[PDB]
């Protein structure tokens, strides 16, 4: 099964203009005028937003224009916005079937967010507590959430999720501290450390 | 002017039978302008095209990478289509999205998936369907539950700000928890309600929690 090509990643700054390739062959890019584009935002169904090359369905606004040379089929969005951080998959009939691209990210660039909640009195009413450490608005995507309690490495109950190749948002990352109760209790836990290339932001909350 | 409505399970044992469901508002299914599709993406992964039916074609037009385990079913009556997958093993695991194709034969939209459902999570797991507990994030986070997704809204969607809701975490007990923050004015607190609507569709859960 013979695939179309494009590049995993793409950034821009906000209001510049970027270009995304879609690579076939010419029996689907170059064999046909029916080539179209979808963009996918994380969690969320895909949408028709380029069809026969070049044509906008209804609602699309004309900062999404299309166009193909020889068997590249490009997608250009103008005047990059950070609504139009998603991502971007080209599809193409073919002898019949349809295939897709294999998707781009397109990163809109617009010191990792963090905010700490701790355990509530529901939770612990509940024999609960969990620390919730919630990053975001951070690039690239790599970034190591460390914990510790008491200026003590903890890592009893500690889960973590950070993107990856297999994950859908790309951009933000959760940790919890689940346990037992009074532990908060006992000491002014905690603080989540978070590193980013050298940008270490270690945030410090203690309930009481 | 068109709108699918995808529903069926999203829990599956392995080697049991994935059945997924897609009522067609706005065109019939037996239109011969249009083609009538199964895609599905993996976490993290593209868009697979599975396979189409278009109503005079009775022959099997399928993903061979799907190895002929994917079929078709159509109740013309009700405008529905429905994917059938045998056998299913944990590689089935995707959200599986029904979508309209248009004929090249066409001018709008013309070989483009132009409507799409809103797809539907499919975990295969013999583990069984636990609904979550809500806490109320004082003065919030739905935790203990199986399988993926769960939505969260605020006041009925009739609150939007900021929001984002954040990936979920995976407990070693095969349970996962997650987190949605949002803010309002710090006057009317103690005046104002605040109903957290907590979705989890696999269970057929759905929770309001006061806050």
């Known amino acids: 099964q013979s695939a179309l090509t494009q590049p995993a990643s793409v950034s821009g700054s906000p209001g510049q203009s970027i270009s995304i390739s879609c690579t076939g062959t010419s029996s689907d890019i170059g064999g046909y005028k029916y080539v179209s584009w979808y963009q996918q935002h994380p969690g969320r169904a895909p949408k028709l937003i380029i069809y026969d090359v070049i044509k906008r369905p209804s609602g699309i606004s004309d900062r999404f224009s299309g166009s193909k040379s020889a068997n590249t089929a490009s997608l250009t969005i103008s005047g990059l916005q950070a609504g139009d951080e998603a991502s971007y998959y080209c599809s193409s009939y073919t002898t019949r079937a349809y295939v897709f691209g294999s998707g781009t990210q397109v990163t809109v660039l617009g010191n990792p967010t963090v905010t700490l909640f701790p355990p509530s009195s529901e939770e612990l009413q509940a024999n609960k507590a969990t620390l919730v450490c919630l990053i975001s608005d951070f690039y690239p995507g790599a970034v190591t959430v460390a914990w510790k309690a008491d200026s003590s490495p903890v890592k009893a109950g500690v889960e973590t999720t950070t993107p990856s190749k297999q994950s859908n948002n790309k951009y933000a990352a959760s940790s919890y501290l689940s346990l037992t109760p009074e532990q908060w209790k006992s000491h002014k836990s905690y603080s989540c450390q978070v590193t980013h290339e050298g940008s270490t932001v270690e945030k410090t909350v203690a309930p009481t | 002017q068109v709108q699918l409505q995808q529903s069926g399970p999203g829990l599956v044992k392995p080697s049991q039978t994935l059945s997924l469901t897609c009522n067609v508002y706005?065109?019939?299914?037996?239109?011969?302008?249009?083609?009538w599709t199964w895609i599905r993406q993996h976490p993290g992964k593209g868009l697979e095209w599975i396979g189409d039916i278009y109503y005079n074609s009775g022959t099997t037009h399928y993903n061979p990478s799907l190895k002929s385990r994917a079929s078709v079913s159509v109740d013309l009556s009700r405008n529905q289509f429905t994917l059938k997958v045998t056998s299913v093993t944990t590689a089935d695991a995707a959200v599986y999205y029904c979508?309209?194709?248009?004929?090249?034969?066409?001018?709008?939209?013309?070989?483009?998936?132009?409507?799409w459902g809103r797809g539907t999570m499919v975990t295969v797991s013999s583990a069984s369907t636990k609904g979550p507990s809500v806490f109320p994030l004082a003065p919030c986070l739905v935790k203990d539950y199986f399988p993926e997704p769960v939505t969260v809204s605020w006041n009925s969607g009739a609150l939007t700000s900021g929001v984002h809701t954040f990936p979920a975490v995976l407990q070693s007990s095969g349970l996962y928890s997650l987190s949605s923050v949002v803010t309002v004015p710090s006057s009317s607190l103690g005046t104002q309600t605040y109903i957290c609507n907590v979705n989890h569709k696999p269970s057929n859960t759905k929770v309001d929690k006061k806050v």
């Open positions: 979508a309209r194709e248009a004929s090249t034969k066409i001018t709008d939209d013309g070989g483009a998936f132009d409507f």
């Open positions: 706005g065109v019939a299914i037996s239109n011969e302008d249009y083609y």
